[PDB]
Design an enzyme around this catalytic site. Structure first.
Site, mmCIF file in Angstrom:
data_model
loop_
_atom_site.group_PDB
_atom_site.id
_atom_site.type_symbol
_atom_site.label_atom_id
_atom_site.label_comp_id
_atom_site.label_asym_id
_atom_site.label_seq_id
_atom_site.Cartn_x
_atom_site.Cartn_y
_atom_site.Cartn_z
ATOM 1 N N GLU A 181 45.477 42.461 41.804
ATOM 2 C CA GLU A 181 46.110 43.719 42.193
ATOM 3 C C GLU A 181 47.540 43.575 42.703
ATOM 4 O OE1 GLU A 181 43.528 45.876 44.961
ATOM 5 O OE2 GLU A 181 42.663 46.896 43.229
ATOM 6 N N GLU A 205 36.596 46.119 38.646
ATOM 7 C CA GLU A 205 35.932 46.306 39.932
ATOM 8 C C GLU A 205 35.412 47.731 40.034
ATOM 9 O OE1 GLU A 205 38.378 45.147 43.260
ATOM 10 O OE2 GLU A 205 39.218 43.448 42.151
#
Ligand SMILES: OC[C@H]1O[C@H](O)[C@H](O)[C@@H](O)[C@H]1O
Ligand SMILES: OC[C@H]1O[C@H](O)[C@H](O)[C@@H](O)[C@H]1O
Ligand SMILES: OC[C@H]1O[C@H](O)[C@H](O)[C@@H](O)[C@H]1O
Ligand SMILES: [Cl-]
Ligand SMILES: [Cl-]
Ligand SMILES: [Cl-]
Ligand SMILES: [Zn+2]
Ligand SMILES: [Zn+2]
Ligand SMILES: [Zn+2]
Lengths: 644, 644, 644
Positions: free
Chosen positions: A141, A312
């Site tokens: 991320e 995710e």
């Protein structure tokens, strides 16, 4: 296909075999590991310990699971940080951050560039050829915790180099930024500093280039890792896990160096943070707003050029929002099937088992800390059993395209001009409008072909480049341009022809003035489409065109010429819905007035109906439709799939 | 007994004799002085001028007043600060604070430790043997202005030493903190830094140990002074003035080195700062919430092992709250008698006369700046006259005990998990519930014997140590455990058995999931006790037990096994009241449904009734009760005392 | 006369002649240029390029336009900033600001003092004798972006010198500040630091002197430039453009070195920022609150000893407020005539043409970026045509005087004691009260003669010096003193006689206590004037006087003795209106109950009526009145002028 994020390094090695076995029984096929394991792979500077990682990969491979390896550059070891202090980022306030959490590094740091190069090369050479490894996730991320933009010494000097490459001469930069204003004139690139902590507001062109630069720095950092993985790990895919509602990083640009895009979905967390009306915040506390995950699946399918994964997926309550409710019973399954319906190749849950220690000890997993299966486990297993019997048709082109642009986000971030002006909010509003009509959406970047779409929506595209203009000219169906479109040149200046700038080659109209209005100040815009109280943003349009909607003072709010439309005001959900409905009808598209909590998404000839609750609703399936999953009556937090 | 805080150094020496005389006529017996007089005792480095202090003490002694001397370490002289810059504290933001106010020093500074040692030894040797001196107050409100926790270089190195003593090996620390997470692993204590300014959230175990350390630093600083006073001033008591609603400092721990606890009551200021419902904020603006002072009298009586003083009592409007109303007519008297009813040995008012200069020039005193007596004076004099005729019975053990824990406060400060989760708010809610039932309360720490109590309430005890567990096992009456109790190990990890951890030896239940919900989201929990809309916090309990209260989805909200109860949700005032009422009845305790503004407190066979207004109310005195003060009809801002 | 702010340096030299020509056709007579042109006048250190400035002035002069030159010290060149880093200011947080915007310099920097001296002398010598130049504007809005108060090293040492001059001996300073409190005692001026970043609140006397000092620093910086312009540019006026709602700088004091005052009016921006009731914020979004411009015209006419200009007038939407609406149709004309009615000698619009680049690209001008005339142009041209036919009568003394004081603002900024206490808010409330009665107002400083006024209002004058007292004694009509008046000595101490201090020589009353109350807490004060729910601030008055208004507890809220009145509570608009109305009647003044959106202002025998909308209203003109402009029925956003 289903997967999960696993952390071998958080549990006794004895649990590894049991974990791998249960992952297979649950029906999982992919497992991601290693993105936060640098300190475990190299506890001492130069001393590599691949023992546990080799074994973990071996253990997972033995159960026939495909491993997704993540490079560990997101969290560098404390010793590395202590060695090279320059690595630590500096916030906008000018403070140097510290070790203790994660993402404590700068994208400009040339030293960290080499440290990353080293560890990634090692990792790539060692596992690059393994059959058990299916691919890699670079870092973790980029930008989380507002880390895309850094304000340290390294950034300032790197920014100058960037500027010289882009402008060539300091003269071109002075003209572009209009530095005559407030005596900002620069004698050389060496005199230009970062656009922060300035007395009064910084120059918009200056700040925008800084945002462009910051994003480019991330892509460069990532490109380095991709080059290494392509050289030492041929045949293995490479991806990255993007975030929800995050625009600091140009995902379209960075994804060009990837095989496909991946993203991390946490509906409950995003929703708790969204400024929704009182009633909705309570109604969707345990489900997430109906379009929060869907918008991102569409966006990322586009960012990935048609291919994406949900790396995710929320399987239970998280730890980071002001409020962290539990997903309602069945929501993990709903979110999973929804992602799959939107084309996700794989849906991987974060995480296998809830950690009993550290920062995210309150972040649930598929299993509780005592290893007992949690609610998410049963829901995922159910999806696995259902999916085995339901091979999916291919994803077809949606009837409507939504033109999203990261650069546009930066421009409005730099110059909102109206406190309530929100790029994501504007985009989301148009998106939900289409979704409530039961229409499927494809999100695409400026310049991408609109061939085949019934019509397209451009929430707002401040800068209109030739490529984008061309794509609009070649459009086969109507194109709706949102307010402020074509209102800026590439150098953040007002076009000589005034907004909508280049779009004036398509629409004979000029925006001679704009207004940002205080909340509550509304004025009815009316016409054949209806009566709409509008506020927040309003533009004065000078044109020979007869507006389709007119305010009480006679000024136009919506114009059209040929296949092109222009909205001169912030739309209300009501206007967006009626305008979009009218366009759909004109295009011969059929539309449905879906109830508040129901959403649809097609895949091939199949139609998926997702009910965000709180009560049951009927799926608008054609008569004689053959149901593949569920029933016409869709309970709350449940779904249905049928052949239309 | 009544007293007052006096500042001889703020007035011409000529006024001293008159002041001392009027203090005696008013009926005062104790006077505190000297806590802010360092710059006057030592205007030049090394040049001590005890002249004025000797005279002031002499002047007060001549009127037969007992002097309470405070060590002056709270406000070090500007020259001392200039000499040793390290003394100045650094805020969480990383900024060095400056001279100009007060409490501008760090508890870690080794230099300040010696400077304090010096001045205190001098002060102690010179006045330690005087008959006029009854005792000392160390420093002045440790922690005021968020000064318990410091972030300078001295703290970082002191924190490492603390950590090594607590863990022994860096290995034990890594395991305790679970540093495998986000590659936080440490090679040595030298690598550990302060848990602030980290990218993303800091490690909870790391942050908790820092809070433990910060509090310990204060106790160590204080212990030094206590040792000096015990050695050079034998027979003289030693105390410290704690604050309202302050948990950064573990008052229970520090008070172990004191003869008794003291605290500073400013009801109006605390109340203006409390987030009370709209109606109450207006109703109690000039009186303070009915339980704001009482909660602290009970807490501090417990902190002082049964003995406490109100070293500072509000006598009029203060200067530091966003709103500073005047106490309503009679409130100073009410607060005074209330403190005495709760067992306060002495009630000392801050201050004798309003200062016409500096920061607190708007802070009222018993006298206005022109020396004319203010409203507080007459009310205090009245209490003195009433008290002379009313020797008080001894304080008996309350029927209910409330288990308060500072460590619990730190844990929830580190990990609220829910934005509205509030430890003090939870504690206060249970406290007010008991108070509205007319029940007297004793506040005790974990591990303290619950022998003799009808029943006990534990708002929340995240960490349950053996001593605490033992005290619960030996409990003679029911014990109610609040949500999140036993949910953490000593190292801030989730117990292997899951919450309520050690309490599972008493209650056969497990919390498998928790939820923090947005305000307004309520769900009815119902059973024999009633129907209760609850929100904010909710836990999923796995157990063979039949819940006493059940939510609409069938999940339990309240459980019981034997004498132990467990509340799996944030309680509403209504639930707390009914649950506590039911327990009182079962214990054979009689309860009263007191009106909103009425409060009771017993002392021996006497009962005190305090009416916080705005209208008169009848005291629920038994028939034939003999009134010692006031009447059955209690006017607003007034009270009554009778034999029951 | 009308003018405009022009930026030759922002447009191609070819446009200059056309611009100058159209400025003359529009009816403009004055043009301001050069305040932000330092980097263009000296692109290289020491290399002066007056070429373009000489030509621009020549071009404007050729059309018969008077040039107003502004010294360019507001925005120093990046090279000068790089050379002398000390010039950059430091915020209250302790951070050094950067180049990029404007006003990035410190008033204490001795180096910048010389740099300013140099450029101003050059500029003055070169153009000082030109016939085309009518005068100068020094710098540009001193203090904008919170730049009056600086916290760098230069300020700290400069502050000490200031303090020594004011007090003479450190002893006098210690006594004045009451440094015995919290051991703040100073051994020498060298020990005194800036009153910021202190633990707990800084000393009020200390902070006030810092504010006095900060303002004095600005006047000194300005005085330097005025001396140069008087020496090298004799006969040319000198002024400065003050801001709306800004008190950091003492405009009365600084204006003593000017020929007249000038100010910058942006009604929409100020109003969007004002905390007005919900209904008004929407109603006046496009007009500005009815008294927002007027209050400042009156204030600045007073600051300029009777002479003032509106150097900058909003001609369309601005860029800096959270919301930037467009002025409603006709408002630019209304604001212009309003300014003229209030005595403005010249009304100059900012700016000639909207800039298409940099920070204020969204700030409208009289012309759009494509040079087409914008709405403001036509409205200004109209005012020019109307004005040519309407030579104006002289401005007469208003019937009511309002005593405004910058020092008072600093005192309440230092010690609000009540969160909602607002000096400007109190002043504005009294001002609007007078305005709604149709009364004209003159704003004057303390000490100024009140001779000739029917009555005077003093919203609040905490410090009452002999000169002010004298002016009050010599007052011919009643004087109303607002709460907290005479409550402080010059050294920020409570007067020995208690408030209202020196005013007790006029009013036999004492304020023995004050209260700041939470919003919503109201209590009726009643008497012959009416019944008034009041809150926020309340004072306990001890006096032999029978209050004119009494609260429910019997305490007085309003007192009077002879021609002097004292208000012991924060007034509501209703009370202010009735009290002021009663005073007007007693003084033989006629009053009108004007509707919410109507305002009046006289000039000679003429009366101007301005209608802020949204609907038409009738002008309360006497019968047979002769209208010079408009009609008795005044449309919204329109006006009327008649002979009364
Ligand atoms: O829900 C919390 C998650 O946030 C991101 O998705 C991150 O990649 C994960 O490691 C985890 O921290
Ligand atoms: O009410 C204000 C008071 O706050 C604390 O109690 C402090 O110990 C006192 O010195 C005084 O400042
Ligand atoms: O409306 C914005 C204006 O603010 C001030 O008046 C300043 O002097 C002008 O240069 C302009 O920036
Ligand atoms: Cl895991
Ligand atoms: Cl005193
Ligand atoms: Cl211009
Ligand atoms: Zn950096
Ligand atoms: Zn320190
Ligand atoms: Zn400075």
């Amino acid at each position: 296909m289903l997967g999960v994020c696993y952390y071998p390094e958080h549990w006794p090695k004895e649990r590894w075999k049991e974990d791998a076995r249960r992952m297979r029984e649950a029906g999982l096929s992919h497992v991601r590991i290693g993105e936060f394991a640098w300190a475990l792979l190299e506890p001492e500077p130069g001393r590599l310990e691949w023992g546990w990682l080799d074994e973990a990969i071996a253990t997972l491979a033995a159960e026939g699971l495909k491993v997704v390896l993540g490079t560990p550059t997101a969290t560098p070891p404390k010793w590395l940080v202590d060695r090279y202090p320059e690595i630590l980022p500096v916030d906008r306030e000018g403070r140097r951050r510290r070790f203790g959490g994660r993402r404590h590094y700068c994208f400009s740091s040339p030293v960290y560039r080499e440290e990353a190069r080293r560890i990634v090369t090692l990792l790539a050479e060692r596992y690059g050829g393994l059959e058990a490894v299916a691919g890699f996730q670079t870092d973790n991320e980029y930008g989380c915790h507002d880390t895309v933009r850094c304000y340290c010494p390294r950034c300032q000097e790197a920014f100058r180099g960037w500027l010289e490459a882009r402008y060539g001469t300091i003269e071109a930069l002075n003209e572009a930024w209009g530095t005559a204003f407030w005596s900002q004139r620069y004698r050389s690139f060496a005199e230009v500093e970062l656009p922060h902590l300035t007395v009064a507001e910084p120059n918009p062109s200056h700040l925008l280039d800084y945002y462009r630069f910051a994003s480019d720095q991330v892509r460069a950092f990532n490109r380095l890792q991709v080059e290494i993985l392509r050289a030492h790990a041929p045949g293995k895919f490479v991806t990255h896990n993007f975030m929800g509602f995050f625009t600091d990083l140009d995902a379209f640009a960075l994804a060009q160096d990837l095989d496909f895009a991946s993203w991390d979905s946490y509906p409950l967390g995003f929703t708790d943070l969204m400024p929704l009306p009182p009633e909705e915040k309570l109604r969707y506390a345990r489900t997430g707003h109906p379009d929060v995950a869907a918008f991102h699946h569409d966006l990322y399918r586009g960012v990935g050029r048609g291919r994406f994964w949900v790396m995710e997926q929320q399987p239970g309550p998280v730890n980071w929002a002001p409020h962290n409710p539990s997903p309602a019973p069945g929501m993990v399954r709903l979110w999973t099937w929804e992602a799959l319906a939107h084309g996700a190749e794989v849906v991987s849950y974060f995480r296998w088992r809830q950690a009993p220690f550290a920062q995210e000890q309150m972040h649930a997993g598929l299993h509780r800390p005592d290893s007992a299966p949690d609610q998410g486990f049963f829901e995922a297993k159910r999806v696995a059993e259902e999916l085995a019997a339901l091979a999916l048709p291919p994803v077809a082109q949606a009837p409507v395209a939504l033109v999203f642009d990261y650069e546009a986000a930066w421009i409005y971030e730099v110059q909102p001009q109206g406190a309530e002006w929100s790029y994501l909010g504007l985009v989301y509003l148009f998106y939900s409008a289409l979704r409530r009509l039961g229409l499927d959406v494809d999100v695409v970047p400026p310049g991408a072909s609109l061939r085949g779409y019934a019509f397209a929506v451009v929430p707002s595209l401040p800068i209109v480049r030739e490529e984008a203009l061309e794509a609009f000219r070649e459009a086969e169906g109507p194109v709706l341009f949102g307010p402020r479109s074509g209102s800026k040149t590439e150098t953040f200046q007002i076009p000589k022809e005034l907004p909508p700038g280049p779009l004036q080659a398509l629409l004979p109209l000029k925006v001679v003035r704009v207004e940002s209005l205080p909340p509550g100040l509304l004025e009815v815009a009316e016409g054949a489409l209806g009566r709409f109280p509008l506020g927040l943003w309003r533009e004065w349009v000078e044109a020979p065109l007869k507006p389709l909607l007119t305010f009480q003072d006679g000024k136009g709010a919506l114009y059209r010429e040929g296949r092109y439309l222009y909205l001169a005001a912030w739309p209300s959900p009501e206007l967006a819905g009626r305008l979009l409905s009218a366009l759909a009808a004109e295009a011969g598209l059929k539309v449905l007035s879906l109830p508040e909590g129901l959403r649809l998404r097609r895949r091939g000839t199949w139609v998926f109906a997702f009910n965000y609750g709180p009560e049951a609703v009927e799926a608008p399936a054609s008569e004689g439709a053959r149901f593949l999953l569920g029933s016409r009556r869709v309970g709350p937090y449940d779904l249905a799939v049928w052949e239309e």
